[PDB]
Amino acid sequence: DQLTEEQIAEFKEAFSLFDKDGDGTITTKELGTVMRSLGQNPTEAELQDMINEVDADGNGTIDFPEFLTMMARKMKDTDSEEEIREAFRVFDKDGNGYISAAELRHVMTNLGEKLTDEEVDEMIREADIDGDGQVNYEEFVQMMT
Ligand SMILES: CCCCOc1ccc([C@@H](C)NCCCNCCC(c2ccccc2)c2ccccc2)cc1OCCCC
Ligand SMILES: [Ca+2]
Ligand SMILES: [Ca+2]
Ligand SMILES: [Ca+2]
Ligand SMILES: [Ca+2]
């Protein structure tokens, strides 16, 4: 089988966040920008290593099909939480355990992706379960898969 229309719509939007020029391919330069936007600072060598890991046709760049392949499977029951754990840590700017509407809005922004109040209000509402108005690690994990 395959992902739904909306599912596709979500993978493409996250792909466009790496593809700054919008030409359809992710370069090491475009990946670096994203890393720097996250406070991190990798080297050309490391950047190319990250790309080579998913470059199925080995042309030095990543495309949507290449991007989706790596997405549609953590191919690991172990070490998948080690990524979700870091993802959550990226958003929880104050390691308080709870992700707020402001931390989410703050991060999404640094990634050249300005949201709307209504958009930000829906991403949180949908993930919030305990009704505290914030997304804890628990809620975060389930929202992923
Ligand atoms: C990051 C790119 C999309 C992948 O992450 C996923 C994002 C949303 C889902 C679905 C099933 N859950 C939520 C439905 C869509 N509502 C928007 C959620 C929103 C979001 C939710 C909670 C907190 C902050 C944001 C969002 C948007 C874009 C990227 C990440 C998160 C599954 C994912 O898993 C698919 C990965 C392959 C197994
Ligand atoms: Ca590009
Ligand atoms: Ca490629
Ligand atoms: Ca927080
Ligand atoms: Ca909550």
Short mmCIF file of C-alpha atoms and ligand atoms in Angstrom, two decimals:
data_model
loop_
_atom_site.label_atom_id
_atom_site.label_comp_id
_atom_site.label_asym_id
_atom_site.label_seq_id
_atom_site.Cartn_x
_atom_site.Cartn_y
_atom_site.Cartn_z
CA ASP A 1 0.00 0.00 0.00
CA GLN A 2 0.96 3.67 0.27
CA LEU A 3 0.47 6.84 2.31
CA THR A 4 -2.64 8.98 1.84
CA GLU A 5 -2.87 12.31 0.03
CA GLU A 6 -2.48 14.33 3.23
CA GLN A 7 0.36 12.05 4.31
CA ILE A 8 2.15 12.97 1.09
CA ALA A 9 1.32 16.63 1.63
CA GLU A 10 3.15 16.51 4.96
CA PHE A 11 6.31 14.82 3.72
CA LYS A 12 6.63 17.34 0.88
CA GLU A 13 6.24 20.32 3.19
CA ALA A 14 8.97 19.00 5.48
CA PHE A 15 11.06 18.39 2.35
CA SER A 16 10.65 21.99 1.19
CA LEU A 17 12.15 23.08 4.52
CA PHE A 18 15.48 21.53 3.46
CA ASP A 19 15.11 22.57 -0.17
CA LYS A 20 15.54 26.34 0.17
CA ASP A 21 15.84 27.20 -3.53
CA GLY A 22 12.98 24.86 -4.37
CA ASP A 23 14.73 23.12 -7.27
CA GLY A 24 13.75 19.68 -6.03
CA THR A 25 17.04 18.52 -4.58
CA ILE A 26 18.68 18.90 -1.19
CA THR A 27 22.36 19.82 -1.26
CA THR A 28 24.95 19.66 1.50
CA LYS A 29 24.89 23.46 1.55
CA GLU A 30 21.12 23.46 2.08
CA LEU A 31 21.43 20.80 4.79
CA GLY A 32 24.10 22.80 6.57
CA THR A 33 21.89 25.89 6.71
CA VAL A 34 19.24 23.78 8.41
CA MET A 35 21.78 22.41 10.90
CA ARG A 36 23.02 25.89 11.76
CA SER A 37 19.40 26.95 12.21
CA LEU A 38 19.31 24.32 14.95
CA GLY A 39 22.37 25.67 16.74
CA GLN A 40 24.43 22.73 15.52
CA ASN A 41 27.53 23.20 13.36
CA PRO A 42 28.68 20.27 11.17
CA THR A 43 31.59 20.15 8.72
CA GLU A 44 31.47 19.60 4.99
CA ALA A 45 32.86 16.10 5.57
CA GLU A 46 30.12 15.23 8.07
CA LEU A 47 27.44 16.89 5.95
CA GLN A 48 28.35 14.74 2.95
CA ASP A 49 28.33 11.65 5.18
CA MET A 50 24.75 12.43 6.19
CA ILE A 51 23.79 12.76 2.52
CA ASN A 52 25.63 9.64 1.32
CA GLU A 53 23.58 7.64 3.81
CA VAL A 54 20.41 8.28 1.78
CA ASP A 55 21.75 9.14 -1.72
CA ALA A 56 20.26 6.05 -3.42
CA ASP A 57 21.49 7.08 -6.87
CA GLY A 58 24.74 8.65 -5.56
CA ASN A 59 24.57 12.01 -7.41
CA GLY A 60 25.45 14.00 -4.31
CA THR A 61 21.91 15.26 -3.67
CA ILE A 62 18.61 14.10 -2.16
CA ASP A 63 15.24 14.12 -3.94
CA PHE A 64 11.65 13.53 -2.77
CA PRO A 65 11.62 9.82 -3.58
CA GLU A 66 15.00 9.46 -1.85
CA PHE A 67 13.61 11.53 1.05
CA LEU A 68 10.42 9.49 1.39
CA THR A 69 12.24 6.14 1.36
CA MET A 70 14.19 7.05 4.50
CA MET A 71 11.01 8.39 6.09
CA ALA A 72 8.52 5.55 5.59
CA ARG A 73 10.55 3.41 7.99
CA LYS A 74 12.72 3.79 11.07
CA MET A 75 13.80 0.26 10.21
CA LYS A 76 14.57 -0.04 13.91
CA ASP A 77 12.53 -0.63 17.05
CA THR A 78 15.70 0.46 18.82
CA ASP A 79 17.44 3.77 18.12
CA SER A 80 14.21 5.28 16.80
CA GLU A 81 13.50 6.76 20.21
CA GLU A 82 17.07 8.04 20.23
CA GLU A 83 16.03 10.26 17.33
CA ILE A 84 12.58 11.15 18.65
CA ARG A 85 14.30 11.93 21.95
CA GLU A 86 16.60 14.45 20.28
CA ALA A 87 13.77 15.83 18.10
CA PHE A 88 11.84 16.55 21.29
CA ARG A 89 14.93 18.13 22.88
CA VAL A 90 15.25 20.50 19.92
CA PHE A 91 11.79 21.92 20.69
CA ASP A 92 11.94 21.90 24.48
CA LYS A 93 14.18 24.97 24.68
CA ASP A 94 14.13 24.83 28.49
CA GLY A 95 14.37 21.08 29.00
CA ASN A 96 11.32 21.45 31.24
CA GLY A 97 9.81 18.39 29.63
CA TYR A 98 6.94 20.33 28.09
CA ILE A 99 6.85 21.86 24.61
CA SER A 100 4.89 25.12 24.45
CA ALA A 101 3.16 26.96 21.62
CA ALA A 102 5.95 29.55 21.79
CA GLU A 103 8.81 27.06 21.61
CA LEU A 104 7.23 25.38 18.63
CA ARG A 105 6.61 28.70 16.91
CA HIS A 106 10.16 29.78 17.75
CA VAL A 107 11.75 26.66 16.21
CA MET A 108 9.52 26.45 13.15
CA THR A 109 10.55 30.02 12.42
CA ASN A 110 14.33 29.60 12.60
CA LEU A 111 13.63 27.05 9.86
CA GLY A 112 12.31 29.60 7.39
CA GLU A 113 8.73 28.44 7.91
CA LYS A 114 6.50 31.09 9.47
CA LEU A 115 3.23 29.60 10.69
CA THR A 116 -0.12 31.19 11.52
CA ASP A 117 -1.71 31.50 14.94
CA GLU A 118 -4.43 29.11 13.77
CA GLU A 119 -1.84 26.71 12.35
CA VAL A 120 0.19 26.75 15.58
CA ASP A 121 -3.01 26.44 17.60
CA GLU A 122 -3.99 23.28 15.69
CA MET A 123 -0.62 21.53 15.84
CA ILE A 124 -0.63 21.84 19.63
CA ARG A 125 -4.34 21.09 20.12
CA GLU A 126 -4.08 17.90 18.07
CA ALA A 127 -1.07 16.64 20.04
CA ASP A 128 -2.20 17.72 23.50
CA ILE A 129 -4.01 14.89 25.30
CA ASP A 130 -3.84 15.69 29.02
CA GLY A 131 -5.37 19.05 28.16
CA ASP A 132 -2.56 21.04 29.80
CA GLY A 133 -2.16 23.04 26.59
CA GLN A 134 1.40 21.78 26.17
CA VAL A 135 3.02 18.76 24.55
CA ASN A 136 5.01 16.51 26.87
CA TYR A 137 7.45 13.84 25.73
CA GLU A 138 4.63 11.30 26.00
CA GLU A 139 2.18 13.19 23.81
CA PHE A 140 5.09 13.98 21.45
CA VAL A 141 6.06 10.32 20.95
CA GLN A 142 2.53 9.12 20.17
CA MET A 143 2.01 11.98 17.71
CA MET A 144 5.02 10.67 15.77
CA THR A 145 3.89 7.05 15.57
C1 LIG B 1 8.68 15.46 9.92
C2 LIG B 1 8.05 14.94 8.62
C3 LIG B 1 6.80 14.08 8.84
C4 LIG B 1 7.06 12.79 9.64
O1 LIG B 1 6.52 12.87 10.96
C5 LIG B 1 5.19 12.61 11.20
C6 LIG B 1 4.30 13.69 11.44
C7 LIG B 1 2.94 13.48 11.69
C8 LIG B 1 2.39 12.18 11.72
C9 LIG B 1 0.91 11.96 11.98
C10 LIG B 1 0.52 10.47 11.87
N1 LIG B 1 0.52 12.55 13.29
C11 LIG B 1 0.02 13.95 13.30
C12 LIG B 1 -0.90 14.32 12.12
C13 LIG B 1 -0.50 15.62 11.41
N2 LIG B 1 -0.62 16.83 12.25
C14 LIG B 1 0.53 17.76 12.27
C15 LIG B 1 1.60 17.48 13.35
C16 LIG B 1 2.65 18.58 13.57
C17 LIG B 1 3.04 18.72 15.05
C18 LIG B 1 2.49 17.86 16.03
C19 LIG B 1 2.84 17.99 17.38
C20 LIG B 1 3.75 18.98 17.79
C21 LIG B 1 4.30 19.84 16.83
C22 LIG B 1 3.95 19.71 15.48
C23 LIG B 1 3.90 18.38 12.70
C24 LIG B 1 3.99 18.98 11.43
C25 LIG B 1 5.13 18.81 10.63
C26 LIG B 1 6.20 18.02 11.09
C27 LIG B 1 6.12 17.41 12.35
C28 LIG B 1 4.98 17.59 13.15
C29 LIG B 1 3.27 11.10 11.48
C30 LIG B 1 4.64 11.29 11.23
O2 LIG B 1 5.36 10.13 11.02
C31 LIG B 1 5.69 9.68 9.70
C32 LIG B 1 7.14 9.19 9.64
C33 LIG B 1 7.30 7.81 8.98
C34 LIG B 1 6.92 6.64 9.89
CA CA B 2 17.64 22.76 -3.34
CA CA B 3 20.39 11.27 -4.99
CA CA B 4 9.54 23.94 27.23
CA CA B 5 -0.42 18.01 27.31
#
